Amino acid sequence: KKEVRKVRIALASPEKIRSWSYGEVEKPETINYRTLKPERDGLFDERIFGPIKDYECACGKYKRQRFEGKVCERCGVEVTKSIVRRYRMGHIELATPAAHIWFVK
Amino acid sequence: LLMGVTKSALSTKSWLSAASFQNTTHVLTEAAIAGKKDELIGLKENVILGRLIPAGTGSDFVRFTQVVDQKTLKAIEEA
Amino acid sequence: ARQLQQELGREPTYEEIAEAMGPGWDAKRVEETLKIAQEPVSLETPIGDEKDSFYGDFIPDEHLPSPVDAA
Amino acid sequence: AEPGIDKLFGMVDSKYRLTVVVAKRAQQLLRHGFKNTVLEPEERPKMQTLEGLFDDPNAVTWAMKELLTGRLVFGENLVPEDRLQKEMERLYP
Amino acid sequence: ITIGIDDAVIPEEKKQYLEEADRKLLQIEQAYEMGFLTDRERYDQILQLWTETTEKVTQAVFKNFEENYPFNPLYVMAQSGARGNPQQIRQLCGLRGLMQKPSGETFEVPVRSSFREGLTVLEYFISSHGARKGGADTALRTADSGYLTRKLVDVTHE
Amino acid sequence: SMARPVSIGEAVGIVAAQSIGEPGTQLTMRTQGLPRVIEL
Amino acid sequence: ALLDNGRRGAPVTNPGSDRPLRSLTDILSGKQGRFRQNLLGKRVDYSGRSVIVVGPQLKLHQCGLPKRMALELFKPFLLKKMEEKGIAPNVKAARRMLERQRDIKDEVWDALEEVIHGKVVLLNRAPTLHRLGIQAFQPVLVEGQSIQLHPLVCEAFNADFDGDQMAVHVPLSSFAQAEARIQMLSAHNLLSPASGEPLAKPSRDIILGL
Amino acid sequence: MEIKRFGRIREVIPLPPLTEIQVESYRRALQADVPPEKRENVGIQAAFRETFPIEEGLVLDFLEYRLGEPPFPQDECREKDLTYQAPLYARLQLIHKDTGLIKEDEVFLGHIPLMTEDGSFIINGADRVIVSQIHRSPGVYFTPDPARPGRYIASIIPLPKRGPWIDLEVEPNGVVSMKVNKRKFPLVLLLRVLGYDQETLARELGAYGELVQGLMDESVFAMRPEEALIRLFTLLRPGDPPKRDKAVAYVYGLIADPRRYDLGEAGRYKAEEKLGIRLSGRTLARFEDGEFKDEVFLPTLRYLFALTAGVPGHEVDDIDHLGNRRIRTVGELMTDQFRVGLARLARGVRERMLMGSEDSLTPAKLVNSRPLEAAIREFFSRSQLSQFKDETNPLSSLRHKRRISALGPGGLTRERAGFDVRDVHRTHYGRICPVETPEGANIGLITSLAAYARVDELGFIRTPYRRVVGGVVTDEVVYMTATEEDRYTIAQANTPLEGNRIAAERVVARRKGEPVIVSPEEVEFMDVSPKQVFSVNTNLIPFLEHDDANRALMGSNMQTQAVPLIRAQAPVVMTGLEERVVRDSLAALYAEEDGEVAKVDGNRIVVRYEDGRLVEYPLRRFYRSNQGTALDQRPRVVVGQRVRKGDLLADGPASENGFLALGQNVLVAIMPFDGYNFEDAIVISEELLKRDFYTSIHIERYEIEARDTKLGPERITRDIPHLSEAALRDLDEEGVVRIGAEVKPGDILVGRTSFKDVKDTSLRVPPGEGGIVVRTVRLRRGDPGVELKPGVREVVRVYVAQKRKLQVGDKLANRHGNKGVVAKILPVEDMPHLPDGTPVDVILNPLGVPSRMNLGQILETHLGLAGYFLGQRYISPIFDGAKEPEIKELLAQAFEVYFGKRKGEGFGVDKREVEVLRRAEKLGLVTPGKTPEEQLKELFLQGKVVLYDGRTGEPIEGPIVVGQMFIMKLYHMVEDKMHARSTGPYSLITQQPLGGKAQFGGQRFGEMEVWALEAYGAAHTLQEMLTLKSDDIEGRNAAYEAIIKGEDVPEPSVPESFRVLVKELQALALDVQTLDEKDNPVDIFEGLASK
DNA sequence: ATGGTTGGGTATAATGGGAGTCGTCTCGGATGCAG
DNA sequence: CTGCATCCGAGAGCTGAGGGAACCCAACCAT
Ligand SMILES: Nc1ncnc2c1ncn2[C@@H]1O[C@H](COP(=O)(O)OP(=O)(O)OP(=O)(O)OP(=O)(O)OC[C@H]2O[C@@H](n3cnc4c(N)ncnc43)[C@H](O)[C@@H]2O)[C@@H](O)[C@H]1O
Ligand SMILES: Nc1nc2c(ncn2[C@@H]2O[C@H](COP(=O)(O)CP(=O)(O)OP(=O)(O)O)[C@@H](O)[C@H]2O)c(=O)[nH]1
Ligand SMILES: [Mg+2]
Ligand SMILES: [Mg+2]
Ligand SMILES: [Mg+2]
Ligand SMILES: [Zn+2]
């Protein structure tokens, strides 16, 4: 682990933003009203942001370690630490371009 | 030139301290446009990053000092 | 419920609402329906007069293991 | 005040260097279980409990006492760290 | 060391000093009824007279303490630096003095009673203005000083 | 605070800011007073 | 509105309320923003708070610390010391024993007294106007619920005894303890950093008696 | 004990009811007991008469309203967490203009909360108080121009949220201009709209010079009024199509619609008195016969021009004058919220009238009452002026009910208000207390009503004065506002009188607040009492005239925080107001009529009145206040005792025989003691603890709920796994701790299991708490009156009681602002004692007096010494009471008793007393040449006695002030504050320790603490604070593991808050990247965020 | 194989909204005035 | 063409503690 010596801040290109994202958020749904589980393609989808439980996919086929980096075929959720839910970003593809207000106002 | 403390502090090279001081949006947009690199010279930046501040026991003048007894030093001398 | 309150002159009980809906309705089902109809509150709801305390400041994290648990 | 604090402050060019030396010596003493000490068996820092006097568990006090004795060498670039640690381990497992 | 009501010794000279003042005030009024003085001049003359009377009362109080009661508790407290300053002791013993209106201007009549003698209702209400102004001053000052300190830390931290 | 030459590594900027700011709280009354210091 | 709410036009609010929604810019900036609330200042572990009481019998480098406060503050060290002795078979048993008040015995207090030997704690009174608002003291375990403070540091703290409260912090490692004992010890800080004049000096009753 | 009272001032009238400001206001707002035909046009009746008729065709018209009875009593509402309210019914009729049919129906509109007898509300089971708000009165004002001297600005201000503020100003180019809604435009246009010709304006304003010339504009006048109206509408609403009827409606709603613009009754009155004209209604203009008619604008412009021309009889306005500031009480605020709800109801009605089938429509179907209920609930639950009632003691509640606030919805802001609003105005005299106010950032913005003051029907505070005619003070009392008060010369209440004739050639008086000296003939009014200048709290401080105002502020504020004691006593020196305070708080019980007591019990008193009717009064016993203090009533009567009307039957909390009893009378010595009373600390004797002085009772409530979960319901039961029977002793068969069991931190109060096949989720006593379990309450689903939240099957509450004795760290205070923490508790043999063997109870440091200048406590101590040896109590009213000679005579009698006792037993003067007398002879306290007894009497007359040291037996080298002092225990208890944490809960987002003792939180290491750490050069300590102890998750886990394993803590890592910052900066489309020395990226997220 | 969920449909005529807020201070772009 | 001069808008005002409103009908994936 190299030591941190400088911190740089710069504008982000659309290509950079799309490389950050693990998937596009296509629906405004947050969670299901019956099961209180994340809705697919929503703001909390486990397919985009990661699993809620540690080393366990959405549909329960895999519930154990050693499957790091493996994506379940039925549910599409990677098997890894749940902490990735506070690191992994998403993105929204705008139909029309919009201006960043910081550079306008 | 002569400027007050606020304008002098907001005009520093380090964008982290200026952003954590005041006028955060302006400092951030200017730094992002310029692509500024913060070299972590002052204390506020190192505090923000949770590092060892370049002062006191964290100063480069004293923080590389070593300590050893006479017996261990002589063994290394023979080596 | 609003019509029953207008008729009774007070907030109706769940059994009265269940009776007024029709067949296939009991007080328990009305309770579940009112439960799922609750809308979430904001984590940024101000608590107290001063603008320094939010609701989310009073909510502990129950997911990550504690230092005692990790040890 | 800590005993001999004036002498310790006069032994170094900067007070933070004194703090660094004391902390590093305390770490060294803790790592080897006080077997690498330079104190004679009657200068050891003692602690009084009901059962009787035992050794002081606080390593920082030991480090200040040892610095007072003057048998410790401190400075910049005395010995490579890896060799220093390996030799220390050789004398005191 | 103890504090009793009689330890706030009132000098005799104060009474004389008051009558003397009550003398000159009359003179001032005469000089205003004959056209020799304006409103501003008369107001300033009254203010000056009362300020000098307050200073004379302070000096009399401390001279009495020095000559007659050198071990008096208030005197010892002030002289040793343990507690108290001459102005507060004068307020306890001699007289409170002139007070400021909320507009910032002084009243024409001073508070001629000390805290030992006891104030009247009107004098207490008149002094309430200055008490409240001092409290509000403190309340704003602490915030302004905190902001200034933060700015200084931000400009000198490196 | 020690009546001796300052040690290398001392954060004298923070010390200066605190030294100036401490009396201003309450001590300096409030062109004149704290407003004068702030203006300067 | 997502990037900076309340900047151009009427701010977006949730229906039934006049409260503006908190955008990312609102999160970043202000007194309650990320920088000032979570990065330049934090809430910390191994800390406590209590009312302060005059400690006239204390030495200059000593402070009176309540027994219960000390037991909570040095809990992992106490668990290790209990493991070293025969008080508990294992750390879990020591923790369970320390959990309930009526399950605590006498020897745990002696173990605690051995734990804190030579160590110092940091006392702090808000507002911290100068560096002297934080000072290191050797804790002496006392009964009751009040921290005992030396009379000569009250001027440095701007502390009196009409309800003042102070916070206690525990430096953990050897480096932190060495810094606290050498640099932040109360007996080592006798002159003002601003003027060079004595700051710990006789005052009030001491001056009166002398 | 005999009570002796001083003072010469006789009070013609008693104090008014001290809670009338709430009770009368709410009664007038509700008008519940007034039959509908005689109800006035105030309160909710005015709102009904304004909102209706709801014209659309269909017309919905209001007829009358009624209020029913509450469904549940006050105690049931308190227990079941309900609101104490009454149902409101409005009878309405729907008529059809075209057809004629009338359908009349009584519609239920909801519930209105009811104020109790003491002046508070019960909202969701909690006691609440509505605080009155002070604000600028509506009307017409004229102020100097700040930018340019010699010019003036006129302002028209309506009631809050009832119209826009309107400004009029003479521009520097000569044209007058009217600003409304931030829109400068020439006033001559609107003047033409109102229908004014050139000749009319010229004749009305010709006198005043060139202003009328600068008014003139030929372009506007040439247009017909309708054209001017359209033109004005296009100036005020640029872009909006300029239809005639649209412009008419907009302008009508701006200044002429009573439903949009409203100068209040206060504003109407003030405009009529200022401008010397007669208003027809409450609007600036009237819309009659399709034509605007002026009401206020021309008189305002006339007054402005006359003021600008220097015409005598025209003056600017002081906006801080109490004739220009008014008070909105609980009734007015509630009525305003009611009006808002009624407007929303009207909107809903109109919508349903449009969409509904007009053939089958009734008043019930048209009216949706939800908005009104929502508005009332919002006001009574979320309004800043609705406050959790302070009931530490009865005086706390009485004080809270008389509070006046400048903050709140529509009020001022604490950060923007400066000096002007926080100052004591001259007109505050007799209306607002100049002493009682908060000390911090709220100083001057929150105040208290004066004792004799009254808020009139218009919202202006009035104070009473006696009428003086021909130098003779009469019994006629006139209540006046500040504006009326400004027109007279008012003599001070302490003016000497013979009979009722002014026996003084020179009288001190006030003329518009200015002190003056006048002859008795010039006197018009006289003050009633000094009591009228100060609030109730400030009126309870004896010798207030000897105290600096700041310390009087501290004492007044600190009397509210006094805790009730089980052995509370009334003060030795009283001001004579403690009985009225006890009576007016409705805390004690008094006999309704003359009668005889039949049954007495600890929970009941049954009285037989001469009417022959038996009346039973239950007693409130061990009841938890909002602040955790226990309020109970104790009978003070015996069976068979004869009671007259108004006689005391039971004492309330902090009451002794009907007198306010907030503390204890203790023997105090004023002297230093070994540094244990250093800097406000206090030394007390163990004898106080031995006889249960300063012992209080406190009750805490612990609540748990069993609800429904997806994994199965929770259940409260005794069957809990993985606990021995030693942990389940006190639980009953239902899983609840039994009544009378002692509970300590860690003990289980209510057992609960949750589906994990179940796991322990029981309620236990938090650290630092516990005591005796005194009550348990269980609420289940279906129980009458219970309204649980959906999903919760049942709720269990446990009430646990504590008996707290005085301990080190507790706060004590007297009525003069002297406060201090107990620092040492000494055994009796170590205390200083009198030569007769009596030890003192409290030792106070004399260094607290000279700089605080609160000398009233010294005089209280002297009078207390006199009363202690004479066995009596004293009433000393403020500014008219005990003087020094009287106290000296009482001390002479007390010394005669105190010394004749010793001389009778056959004892002379002690050798130690002789040494002390020699020392005092050197000190100049006694005159040389007198016998030892004479010198001892001289010292006693100075309030000083010879005192012996209990540790050595030698006397204190000088005489020491000793006497009785009244001291109270304060609610600030070290028991509730001491808190410590090693590790605990962490926050969701920042992953940093939580705050607060309740959450087992950690102390905040803020910015300046970091600054101090930096200034010490303690880099490693700071890095530990910022990573290993707050938010370095791996770092803190490793540190705990290393410490418990005996090793040293490892090196820290990147805090989680910085990662949160990086992610939040990425969400703003900013690329933040950490780099090493070679400018290459360094991944701080450990490869968990890289695709 | 069942309930829960989702997409489609209603035919007299309908044609531009609505709450609100006037008691703060200091400093750097900018439109307006003169020369 | 320049310059200065009010004018408008934007960003601030100490820490710590405690504070909590239509209804119906039919096909179709999920479980
Ligand atoms: N909406 C509203 N309506 C009506 N009234 C309202 C109101 N909002 C506020 N108020 C008023 O606010 C006040 C509430 O009291 P508070 O000032 O909040 O507290 P307290 O109960 O007096 O305790 P504290 O510990 O502060 O007491 P003391 O100064 O003796 O303590 C001494 C020591 O405490 C510490 N301390 C006190 N204040 C401090 C501060 N601001 N910052 C830091 N430390 C402080 C110091 O160490 C000091 O030496 C009341 O006067 C009330 O009327
Ligand atoms: N940071 C803040 N601290 C405050 C505030 N108000 C009070 N305090 C603290 O509480 C203290 C209250 O001080 P006091 O009014 O008791 C007077 P002090 O002891 O300084 O002087 P003497 O009366 O001359 O003994 C003050 O010195 C601060 O330490 C405030 O608004 N902010
Ligand atoms: Mg003090
Ligand atoms: Mg204090
Ligand atoms: Mg306070
Ligand atoms: Zn899966």
- For chain D, give every domain's residue range: 1-93
The sign of the dihedral angle between the CA atoms of A80, A85, A86, A88 is positive
Please tell me which of the candidates A5, A10, A103 has its beta carbon nearest to residue B35. Answer: A10
Distance H438 CA to ligand 5 centre (A): 7
Residues 6+ apart with CB under 8 A from H901: H836
Tokens of E54: 């307050």
Which protein residue has its CA closest to C1' of I28?
B7
- DSSP letter for each residue of H330-382: HHHHHHHHHHHHHHHHHHHHHHHHHHS-TTS--HHHH---HHHHHHHHHHHHH
CB H810 within 8 A of CB H821: yes
Closest CA to ligand 1's atom 46: G164
If you search the block for the tokens 């001459």, which residue do you land on? E86
If you search the block for the tokens 């029709």, which residue do you land on? C22
Ligand nearest the Cα of residue A53 is: 6
Class of residue H867 by CB neighbours under 10 A (exposed 0-12, middle 13-18, buried 19+)? buried
E58-84 CB burial, b ≥16 within 10 A, e <16: bbbbbebbeeebeebbbbbbbeeebbb
Residue H811: what residue type?
K
Q: Which chains touch H (3 or more CB pairs under 8 A)?
A: A, B, C, D, E, F, G
Q: How far is CA H632 from CA E98, H565, H635, H650, in A?
A: 50, 11, 10, 10
Rounded to a whole number of angstroms, the distance between the first and last alpha carbons of chain G is: 69
DSSP 8-state code for residue H39: -
Looking only at the bridges linking them, the beta strands covering H819-826 and H682-685 are parallel
A103 touching chain G per CB within 8 A:
no
Closest CA to ligand 1's atom 44: G126
Q: How far is the CA of D33 from the C1' of I33 (A)?
A: 86
Residues 6+ apart with CB under 8 A from H252: H287
The torsion angles phi and psi of H999, rounded to 5 degrees, stand at -85, 5
Element (H, E) at H467: strand H461-469
Q: Which of H925, H921, H954, H950 minimizes the C-alpha distance to H940?
A: H925
Q: How far is the CA of H694 from the C1' of J12 (A)?
A: 48
Rounded to a whole number of angstroms, the distance from the CA of G28 to the nearest CA of chain B is 8
Looking only at the bridges linking them, the beta strands covering H403-405 and H132-136 are parallel
Ligand nearest the Cα of residue A51 is: 6
What is the arrangement of strands in the sheet containing H85-96, beginning at the earlier edge strand? H54-55, H58-67, H85-96, H102-113
Tokens of H614: 């038996």
Q: Which of H819, H823, H808, H822 minimizes the C-alpha distance to H975?
A: H808
The sign of the dihedral angle between the CA atoms of H573, H579, H585, H591 is positive
If you search the block for the tokens 């610390």, which residue do you land on? G65
Q: How many CB atoms lie within 10 A of CB H931?
A: 10
Q: Is-cis flag, bond preceding H53, omega within 30?
A: yes
Q: Which of H845, H809, H674 minimizes the C-alpha distance to G164?
A: H809
Closest CA to ligand 1's atom 17: H440
Separation between Cα atoms, residue A90 and residue A45, nearest integer Å = 10
Q: Which of H436, H170, H159 minimizes the C-alpha distance to H300?
A: H170
* Cα G54–Cα G59–Cα G62 angle in degrees, nearest 5: 75
Class of residue H78 by CB neighbours under 10 A (exposed 0-12, middle 13-18, buried 19+)? middle
Residue F24: what residue type?
G
Kindly provide the residue ranges of all beta strands, DSSP E only, lying in H97-252, ordered along the sequence. Answer: 102-113, 121-123, 126-130, 132-136, 139-144, 152-157, 166-170, 176-180, 184-186
Domains of chain H in sequence order:
1-6+662-694+806-970 (2.40.270.10), 16-137+318-463+529-587 (3.90.1100.10), 138-317 (3.90.1110.10), 464-528 (2.30.150.10), 588-652 (2.40.50.100), 695-805 (2.40.50.150)
Rounded to a whole number of angstroms, the distance from the CA of F16 to the nearest CA of chain B is 14
Tokens of G38: 């979570």
The torsion angles phi and psi of H610, rounded to 5 degrees, stand at -65, -15
Please tell me which of the candidates G14, G31, G95 has its beta carbon nearest to residue C42. Answer: G14
Tokens of H981: 């944490």
SS3 H163: coil
Bridge partners (DSSP) of residue H603 are: none
CB H756 within 8 A of CB H763: no
Ligand nearest the Cα of residue A78 is: 6
Rounded to a whole number of angstroms, the distance from the CA of F40 to the nearest CA of chain H is 22
Report how far Cα H854 is from the mean position of its chain's Cα atoms: 26
Helices E13-33 & E39-68 angle (0-180, nearest 10): 170
Q: Which residues of B touch F (CB under 8 A)?
A: 43, 53, 55-59, 61-62
Residue H559: what residue type?
Q
Tokens of H30: 């509700």
Separation between Cα atoms, residue H251 and residue H261, nearest integer Å = 11
Looking only at the bridges linking them, the beta strands covering G165-169 and H126-130 are unpaired
Q: Do G208 and E82 touch (CB under 8 A)?
A: yes
If you search the block for the tokens 């010699």, which residue do you land on? H150
* Cα G63–Cα G69–Cα G71 angle in degrees, nearest 5: 110
Q: How far is CA E4 from CA H560, H860, H869, in A?
A: 28, 11, 18
Q: Which of H473, H434, H470, H438 minimizes the C-alpha distance to H453?
A: H434
Bridge partners (DSSP) of residue H1070 are: A11
Tokens of H153: 């600005």
Q: Which of H150, C52, G179, H894 minimizes the C-alpha distance to D17?
A: G179
Please tell me which of the candidates G127, G190, G194 has its beta carbon nearest to residue F19. Answer: G194
Dihedral class, residue H93 (left if φ above 0, else alpha if ψ from -120 to 50, else beta): beta
CB H514 within 8 A of CB H415: no
Q: What's the CA dihedral at H562, H563, H564, H569 to 10 degrees?
A: -50
Q: Which of H1032, H1029, H1020 minimizes the C-alpha distance to H1084?
A: H1032
C abuts E (3+ Cβ pairs < 8 Å): no
If you search the block for the tokens 């020196």, which residue do you land on? H573
Residue whose CB lies within 8 A of the most ligand 1 atoms, among H130, H446, H556, H1008, for a mutation test? H446
Residues 6+ apart with CB under 8 A from H343: H51
> CB of H416 under 7 A from strand J?
yes
Q: Is-cis flag, bond preceding G127, omega within 30?
A: yes
Distance A58 CA to ligand 6 centre (A): 5
Closest CA to ligand 2's atom 14: G160
> CB of E151 under 7 A from strand J?
no
- Counting one residue from chain D and one from chain F, the pairs whose CB atoms sit within 8 A come to 9
CB H233 within 8 A of CB H250: yes
The torsion angles phi and psi of C59, rounded to 5 degrees, stand at -115, 115
Separation between Cα atoms, residue E138 and residue H441, nearest integer Å = 9
Residue B69: what residue type?
D
Class of residue H88 by CB neighbours under 10 A (exposed 0-12, middle 13-18, buried 19+)? buried
Q: How many CB atoms lie within 10 A of CB G103?
A: 13
Tokens of E24: 């000159």
Tokens of H1001: 């939180």
Looking only at the bridges linking them, the beta strands covering H132-136 and H944-945 are unpaired
Tokens of D15: 């007070």
Residues 6+ apart with CB under 8 A from A59: A72, A74, A75, A77
Separation between Cα atoms, residue H301 and residue H38, nearest integer Å = 40
Separation between Cα atoms, residue H82 and residue H66, nearest integer Å = 22
Kindly provide the residue ranges of all beta strands, DSSP E only, lying in chain G, ordered along the sequence. Answer: 42-43, 47-54, 62-66, 121-124, 134-142, 147-149, 165-169
Rg (CA), chain H: 36
Q: Do H1015 and F15 touch (CB under 8 A)?
A: yes
Q: Which of G99, G101, G100, G79 minimizes the C-alpha distance to G91?
A: G79
Q: Do F2 and G191 touch (CB under 8 A)?
A: yes
Which nucleotide lies nearest residue A105, CA to C1'?
Answer: J10
A abuts E (3+ Cβ pairs < 8 Å): no
Separation between Cα atoms, residue A94 and residue H1004, nearest integer Å = 42
Q: How many CB atoms lie within 10 A of CB H720?
A: 19
Residue H981: what residue type?
R
SS3 B29: helix
Separation between Cα atoms, residue G128 and residue H1039, nearest integer Å = 28
| CA closest to H1062 among chain A residues | A87
Bridge partners (DSSP) of residue H36 are: none
Rounded to a whole number of angstroms, the distance between the first and last alpha carbons of chain D is: 35
D abuts E (3+ Cβ pairs < 8 Å): no
* Cα E59–Cα E65–Cα E67 angle in degrees, nearest 5: 100
Separation between Cα atoms, residue E76 and residue E66, nearest integer Å = 10
Tokens of H575: 């001001």
CB H1030 within 8 A of CB G44: yes
What fold, for D1-93?
Eukaryotic RPB6 RNA polymerase subunit (3.90.940)
Decide yes or no: CATH 6.10.250.1410 for domain B64-79: yes
Kindly provide the residue ranges of all beta strands, DSSP E only, lying in G94-196, ordered along the sequence. Answer: 121-124, 134-142, 147-149, 165-169
Q: Which positions in chain B touch E155 (Cβ < 8 Å)?
A: 5-6, 8-9
Separation between Cα atoms, residue H1007 and residue G39, nearest integer Å = 9
SS3 H113: strand
A58-88 CB burial, b ≥16 within 10 A, e <16: beeebeeeebeeeebeebbbbbbbbbbebbb
The sign of the dihedral angle between the CA atoms of H1009, H1012, H1016, H1017 is positive
SS3 H751: coil
A75 marked as part of a ligand binding site: yes
CB H87 within 8 A of CB C9: yes
Q: How far is CA G139 from CA D22, G55, G126, G142, H974, in A?
A: 21, 12, 20, 9, 19
Looking only at the bridges linking them, the beta strands covering H461-469 and H184-186 are unpaired
Helices B70-78 & D81-91 angle (0-180, nearest 10): 110
Alpha helices in H500-616 (DSSP H): 549-558, 578-584
If you search the block for the tokens 């005992």, which residue do you land on? G148
Distance G131 CA to ligand 1 centre (A): 25
Tokens of E34: 């004959």
Tokens of G39: 């990065």
Residues 6+ apart with CB under 8 A from H740: H772, H773, H774
Element (H, E) at C20: helix C14-21
If you search the block for the tokens 């003139």, which residue do you land on? H216
Q: Which residues of A touch B (CB under 8 A)?
A: 4-11, 102-103
User: Greatest CA separation found in chain A?
Assistant: 51
SS3 H126: strand
Residue whose CB lies within 8 A of the most ligand 2 atoms, among G128, G154, G155, G158, for a mutation test? G158
A11 touching chain G per CB within 8 A:
no
User: Greatest CA separation found in chain G?
Assistant: 71
Q: How was this structure determined?
A: cryo-EM
